Design a protein around this ligand. Structure first.
Ligand code: A1L1X
Length: 107
C-alpha cells in the first residue's frame, strides 16, 4: 500500500517494459541529436531513467511529487514536438497506460 513502492515495482516496471519506452529511458542528449533550443524551451527535463533513480534513491517526499515528474515527461514531449510526430504518438501511448496503472494506486 506504500505508493512510492507501487510506482517503482508496478507503474515504472510496466512503462519501462513497453514497446515505446526506449526514447524516455534516458535524458534527451541535446548535443548528440543536434537540438540547440531544447534546454531553452524545456525548463525541467524528465525521463523514466531519472524517475527510476529518484525512486531507488529516496528523493521524492511523497508519491504526488513522483507522479508530477511522469506528467512533466509527457507534457515536455508534447511542448517541444509537433502533434502527429512519431515521438508524440509514443508518449501518448505511454501516458494512457500510465494513467490506467495510477487508478489502481493503493490508498
Ligand atoms: C534530430 C532532431 C529531432 N527531431 C525530433 C522530433 O522528431 C521525432 C527530435 C527528438 C525529440 C525527441 C524527444 O522529445 N525525445 C523525448 C526523445 C528523442 C529521441 C532521443 C533518442 C536518444 C535515445 C538518442 O536519446 C533517440 C531518438 C529520439 O527521437 C526519435 C524517435 C523517437 C524516432 C525517430 F525516428 C527519430 C528520433 C530522433 C527525441 O528526438 N530530435
Amino acid at each position: 500500500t506504500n505508493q512510492l513502492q507501487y510506482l517503482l515495482r508496478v507503474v515504472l516496471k510496466t512503462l519501462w517494459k513497453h514497446q515505446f519506452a526506449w526514447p524516455f529511458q534516458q535524458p534527451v542528449d541535446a548535443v548528440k541529436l543536434n537540438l540547440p533550443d531544447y534546454y531553452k524551451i524545456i525548463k525541467t527535463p524528465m525521463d523514466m531513467g531519472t524517475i527510476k533513480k529518484r525512486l531507488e534513491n529516496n528523493y521524492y517526499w511523497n508519491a504526488q511529487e513522483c507522479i508530477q515528474d511522469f506528467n512533466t515527461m509527457f507534457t515536455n514531449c508534447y511542448i517541444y514536438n509537433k502533434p502527429g510526430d512519431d515521438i508524440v504518438l509514443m508518449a501518448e501511448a505511454l501516458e494512457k497506460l500510465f494513467l490506467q496503472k495510477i487508478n489502481e494506486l493503493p490508498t
